[PDB]
Design a protein around this ligand. Structure first.
Ligand SMILES: Cc1cc2nc3c(=O)[nH]c(=O)nc-3n(C[C@H](O)[C@H](O)[C@H](O)COP(=O)(O)O)c2cc1C
Ligand code: SF4
Ligand code: SF4
Ligand code: SF4
Ligand code: SF4
Ligand code: FES
Ligand code: FES
Lengths: 212, 66, 430, 59, 41, 230, 54
């Protein structure tokens, strides 16, 4: 949405932004992994470090990465506008992404969306009239074999219901983040019924190998 | 000056004659009498373009965008 | 010869579906990894290539191509340009869940497989590309690679003997086209997500120009087991062309949707019910079956009652194969709405290089929305068939094809349901 | 549908309907249409001169 | 066994990935170059 | 002596190895229609118009950037070649606005000529027709990015001849704005050359903009002045 | 008219709401439709007689 900057101060460089010299040591590690002659390959990890340090990246951050990695700025603007993570708009301390496409909608994501909606108050896409509760529904995150799923910042949540929704929301309002594991039993990605996996502790190297 | 037009006293100004070869062109222009100037033909020179060299390794040829 | 083959214990490829007694380099050591690998990696890469072509590995991730031919493309005489092994780890195709479990429980077998591949084709470094959605599991892979470096087991002087091999975990930024073969390669380069034209192959010009290759995590994970275990142990499970074990997983409408291994062929009803709970409401309650995940047309009940889950069997059933949504869906749902949300997925995650997939997925998403509300005549649904014929095969990558196929399957099977929907809207308007 | 007077039209409660897109001058077999265009301060494209030779016009 | 053997990833904060990547930048081969340092320079 | 035979419509001709199919067709006289190929820039493959049915293969392949194997047979006038061209031409004309009266390339379009000589005669796609808000690139070049077919030719020209690197693709799906992000007045040398690069009426001349239409003018030989090269 | 929109112009409603109809209208009325080469003769019975056009 609205992929032209439209300057709007609290943007419009130079907005005050800078890294840490410890983060410069991080950037030395990042452009030490990659082969010499192709320094421009680390734009995406360095800009990811910018998104992890500052809450949302401004145009000043992209200009600073253009200063560091001595590329033209326009390719940095391309890569930052292309992907999903790099929210150029400001977001909150906590960023709800409700994954719902084909199996997640088929496992009743609508009560989940309405529970988030009427417990939080604000509609999807936009934010809350404070911080920490921006909300988007997203495409496939990776854990399809469970409930229509919740991503918060670097964490997942599975096996949902509106009272679990109220538990997670009340414990984020109290700050006490729960474990990122699933709910309602099945403590891993498991067949939650009658243990169809192997039962014996596997031996390993003792049984059949050849020419080793 | 009555309508803002472009009149001219030039009947021969609005001709064009399409020919198949320069040889019959010069033969016709010397047959019919009037003096003439002949230019030559310019073609696109065949280059050697390749996508794989557009994604090179140690050359300076690099698309930097794609 | 078997009765199509079915699951057999203790010949599973990996252990630790979830939480076996240990997790460490010592954990994989007691579970039987890094065992006698020095003589394996000192024997010679032609032995690995011949062993792979002997076992007959089928390329995963919806490939349909063998791994042996690709890794025989990788044996170019070494120029000044190095060779790279890039392991794809994205999970698009909603209903995939495939290598999340491997990279969450056993990273050491991925380290096994990438070292076996790099020593066994003349490669030099392994770039492990992980999805940007995978922070915790990515740092689990990081800690496992720290432990492998802490033992000094990989890196320079691999297995003691004089060979260097480094592994670099590169994250993504959230994409689906990076899950493909070559937009992957340019997303490593620092450019944005863009696939490349095919006839210069990544086998000759790749990551910045390295003659490199791309492998999927199931092929990487089976690649040490094929070497350290015997020949035709892996090839005795299924048919002649395809043989091996695949992660058959169910996410949909069953009791306890979950992930298992099986062999290459299975009765699909026995797979769905007798391994993962049971179908919600009985076997008659289902509306349709999808194999493949999301890049594969649907299957009705009368077809799926005899479908064995082989590649050639599903090509004879005019579909493809994949993972984790090999499922049914209930009669109580709008299959038009499910397919239309899948087309919204294909719109929301696709680059806009090629004009035909861009504009065709635009028409298909707007037309599927209009058919959710039923706002046309059947000439429009056959026009949707016509555009889904014209999109396919005129693209750079296979995402246009994967967007073309579900609409094709719907128009193949459920013509009268669309007729009745549009007739109900005709009754609604008048 | 009689073919008479050569009168231009304009928009409902609006400005001039023409564009100076020269299609009428291209199709005019007598070549009686003569158009010179300039755009104005509004940004939209317009004219300056639009002459019909009623002597030449074959209707 | 019927016990969760992970949750060593429960304490992974927002910097630990690149902290680990900084901590694993030794014993490394020198990343062999190709002529120049960049396509434009 | 380093020559490969291609059978363009059965007619054999010798081609230097490594060059494209399209230069072989231009050697024998054929013009496979093209939108993202140009004979001065790098060869991207984003327009899909250059397709051709090469025999003994079920898949139509491109000819903008195809290397030539030994002994081809090229069909430029087959059935599914024409079907692919009509399909791609019907795809292009969906999200392109009705501006052919007011567009500044009435006589010098490319969608118009190739839509006549290869395209369909009826349209579809009743709804839709997205619209991109324009920019203000410079007082020299008038810019309406709605007519932009996202063909990636101004980008390749800028980044490979101008060297300025102020143009880019932004976004995904239909929403790929080709332009400049930071509202910067793109001013460089050779920026006047970009209004002939753009094959559609998306990057036109600002002071010229609405003063003629290219069938009324007549074209005349002349020599460049105020520059030493001419 | 014919259903051949590169030879006869399309009608007004589809001209106002299409894309190819406006393109065919525009180039058909500027250039005229291309005509294959050759020399034809025909003649019909005008009331004076063999009206021939070559
Ligand atoms: C549309 C599309 C989607 C893909 N999705 C995935 C995916 O989710 N995960 C993956 O590892 N590879 C994915 N791939 C890549 C394939 O697995 C491909 O075969 C890979 O580059 C090499 O796999 P192989 O081991 O069979 O050679 C995808 C490719 C395409 C064209
Ligand atoms: S088919 Fe579509 S998604 Fe694939 S490369 Fe072309 S534009 Fe991108
Ligand atoms: S120039 Fe002629 S055809 Fe064009 S809008 Fe004006 S009157 Fe109509
Ligand atoms: S570029 Fe202009 S003349 Fe060509 S199709 Fe588009 S609007 Fe019409
Ligand atoms: S502005 Fe013109 S040249 Fe640039 S991508 Fe768009 S259509 Fe192509
Ligand atoms: S579809 Fe929701 S997790 Fe994959
Ligand atoms: S010329 Fe544009 S695709 Fe080949």
């Amino acid at each position: 949405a609205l992929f032209v900057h439209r300057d709007t101060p609290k943007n419009n460089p130079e907005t005050p932004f800078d890294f840490t010299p410890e983060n410069y040591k991080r950037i030395e590690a990042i452009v030490k992994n990659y082969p010499e002659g192709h320094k421009a390959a680390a734009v995406l990890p360095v800009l990811d470090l910018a998104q992890r340090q500052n809450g949302w990246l401004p145009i000043s951050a992209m200009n600073k990465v253009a200063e560091i990695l001595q590329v033209p700025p326009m390719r940095v603007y391309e890569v930052a506008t292309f992907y999903t993570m790099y929210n150029r708009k400001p977001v909150g301390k906590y960023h709800i992404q409700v994954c719902t496409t084909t199996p997640c909608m088929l496992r009743n994501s609508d009560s989940i969306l309405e529970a988030i909606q009427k417990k939080l108050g604000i509609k999807v896409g936009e934010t809350t009239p404070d911080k920490l509760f921006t909300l988007i529904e997203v495409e496939c995150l990776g854990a399809c074999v469970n409930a229509p799923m919740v991503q918060i910042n670097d964490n997942y949540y599975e096996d949902l219901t509106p009272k679990d929704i109220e538990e997670i929301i009340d414990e984020l309002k109290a700050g006490k983040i729960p474990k990122p594991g699933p709910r309602s039993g099945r403590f891993s990605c498991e067949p939650a019924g009658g243990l169809t996996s192997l039962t014996e502790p596997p031996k390993g190297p003792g049984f059949g190998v050849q020419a080793g | 000056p009555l309508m803002g037009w472009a009149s001219t006293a030039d009947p021969l100004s609005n001709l064009v004659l399409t020919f198949s070869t320069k040889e019959d062109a010069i033969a016709f222009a010397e047959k019919n009498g009037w003096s003439y100037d002949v230019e030559e033909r310019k073609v696109p020179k065949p280059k050697s373009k390749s996508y794989g060299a557009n994604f090179s390794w140690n050359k300076r040829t690099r698309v930097s965008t794609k | 010869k078997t009765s199509f083959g079915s699951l057999k214990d203790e010949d599973r490829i990996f252990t630790n579906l979830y939480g076996r007694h240990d997790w460490r380099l010592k954990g994989a050591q007691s579970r039987g990894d890094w065992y006698k690998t020095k003589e394996i990696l000192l024997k010679g890469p032609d032995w690995i290539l011949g062993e792979v072509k002997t076992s007959g590995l089928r390329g995963r991730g919806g490939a349909g191509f063998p791994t042996g031919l690709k890794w025989s493309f990788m044996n170019k005489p070494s120029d000044g340009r190095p060779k790279y092994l890039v392991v794809n780890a994205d999970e698009g195709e909603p209903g995939t869940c495939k290598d999340r479990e491997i990279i969450r429980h056993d990273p050491h077998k991925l380290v096994e497989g990438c070292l076996v591949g790099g020593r066994a084709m003349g490669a030099r470094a392994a770039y492990i590309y992980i999805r940007g959605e995978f922070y915790n599991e990515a740092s689990n892979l990081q800690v496992a690679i720290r432990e492998a470096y802490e033992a000094g087991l990989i890196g320079k002087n691999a297995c003691g003997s004089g060979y260097d091999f480094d592994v670099f975990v590169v994250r993504g930024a959230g994409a689906y086209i990076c899950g493909e073969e070559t937009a992957l390669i340019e997303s490593i380069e620092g450019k944005q997500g863009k696939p490349r034209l095919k006839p210069p192959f990544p086998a000759d010009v790749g990551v910045f120009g390295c003659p490199t290759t791309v492998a999927n995590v199931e092929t990487v994970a089976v690649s040490p087991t094929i070497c350290r275990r015997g020949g035709a142990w892996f090839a005795s499970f299924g048919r002649e062309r395809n043989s091996g074990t695949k992660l058959f997983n169910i996410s949909g409408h069953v009791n306890n949707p979950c992930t298992v291994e099986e062999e290459m062929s299975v009765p699909l009803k026995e797979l769905i019910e007798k391994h993962a709970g049971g179908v919600t409401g009985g076997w008659d309650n289902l509306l349709a079956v999808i194999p493949g995940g999301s890049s594969t047309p649907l299957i009705p009940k009368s077809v799926c009652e005899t479908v064995l889950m082989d590649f050639d069997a599903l090509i004879q059933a005019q579909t493809g194969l994949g993972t984790a949504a090999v499922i049914v869906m209930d009669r109580s749902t709008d299959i038009v709405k499910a397919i239309a949300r899948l087309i919204e997925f294909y719109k929301h995650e696709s680059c806009g290089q090629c004009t035909p997939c861009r504009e065709g997925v635009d028409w298909m998403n707007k037309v599927m929305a209009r058919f959710v509300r039923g706002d046309a005549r059947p000439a429009e649904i056959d026009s949707l068939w016509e555009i889904s014929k014209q999109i396919e095969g005129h693209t750079i990558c296979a995402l246009g094809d994967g967007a073309a196929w579900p609409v094709q399957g719907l128009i193949r099977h459920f013509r009268p349901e669309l007729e009745e929907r549009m007739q109900r809207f005709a009754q609604q308007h008048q | 549908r009689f073919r008479g007077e050569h009168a231009l039209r304009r928009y409902p409660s609006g400005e001039e309907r023409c564009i100076a897109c020269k299609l009428c001058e291209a199709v005019c077999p007598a070549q009686a249409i003569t158009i010179e265009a300039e755009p104005r301060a509004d940004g939209s494209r317009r004219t300056t001169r639009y002459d019909i030779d009623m002597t030449k016009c074959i209707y | 066994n019927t016990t969760y053997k992970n949750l060593q990833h429960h304490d992974y904060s927002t910097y630990t990935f690149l902290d680990l990547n900084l901590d694993l930048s030794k014993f490394r081969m020198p990343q062999p170059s190709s002529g120049r340092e960049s396509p434009r320079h | 002596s380093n020559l490969i035979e291609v059978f363009v419509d059965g007619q054999s001709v010798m081609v230097e190895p490594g060059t494209t199919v399209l230069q072989a067709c231009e050697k024998v006289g054929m013009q496979i229609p093209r939108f993202c190929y140009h004979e001065r820039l790098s060869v991207a493959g984003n327009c899909r118009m250059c397709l051709v049915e090469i025999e003994k293969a079920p898949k139509v392949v491109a000819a903008c950037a195809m290397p030539v194997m030994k002994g081809w047979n090229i069909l430029t006038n087959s059935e599914k070649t024409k079907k692919a061209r009509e399909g791609v031409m019907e795809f292009l004309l969906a999200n392109h606005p009705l501006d052919c009266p007011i567009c500044d390339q009435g006589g010098e379009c490319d969608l118009q000529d190739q839509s006549m000589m290869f395209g369909s005669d009826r349209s579809r796609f009743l709804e839709g027709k997205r619209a991109v808000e324009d920019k203000n690139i410079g007082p020299l070049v008038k810019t309406i990015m709605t007519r932009c077919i996202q063909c990636t030719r101004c980008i390749r020209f800028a980044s490979e001849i101008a060297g300025v690197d102020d143009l880019g693709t932004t976004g995904r799906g239909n929403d790929m704005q080709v332009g400049t992000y930071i509202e910067k007045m793109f001013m460089s040398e050779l920026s006047g050359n970009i209004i002939d690069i753009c094959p559609v009426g998306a990057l036109t001349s600002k002071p010229y903009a609405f003063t003629a239409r290219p069938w009324e003018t007549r074209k005349t030989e002349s020599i460049d002045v105020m520059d030493a090269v001419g | 008219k014919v259903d051949d929109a590169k030879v006869s112009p399309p009608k007004r409603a589809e001209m106002k709401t299409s894309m190819e109809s406006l393109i065919h209208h525009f180039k058909l009325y500027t250039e005229g439709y291309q005509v294959p080469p050759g020399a034809t003769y025909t003649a019909i019975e005008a009331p004076k007689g063999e009206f021939g056009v070559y």
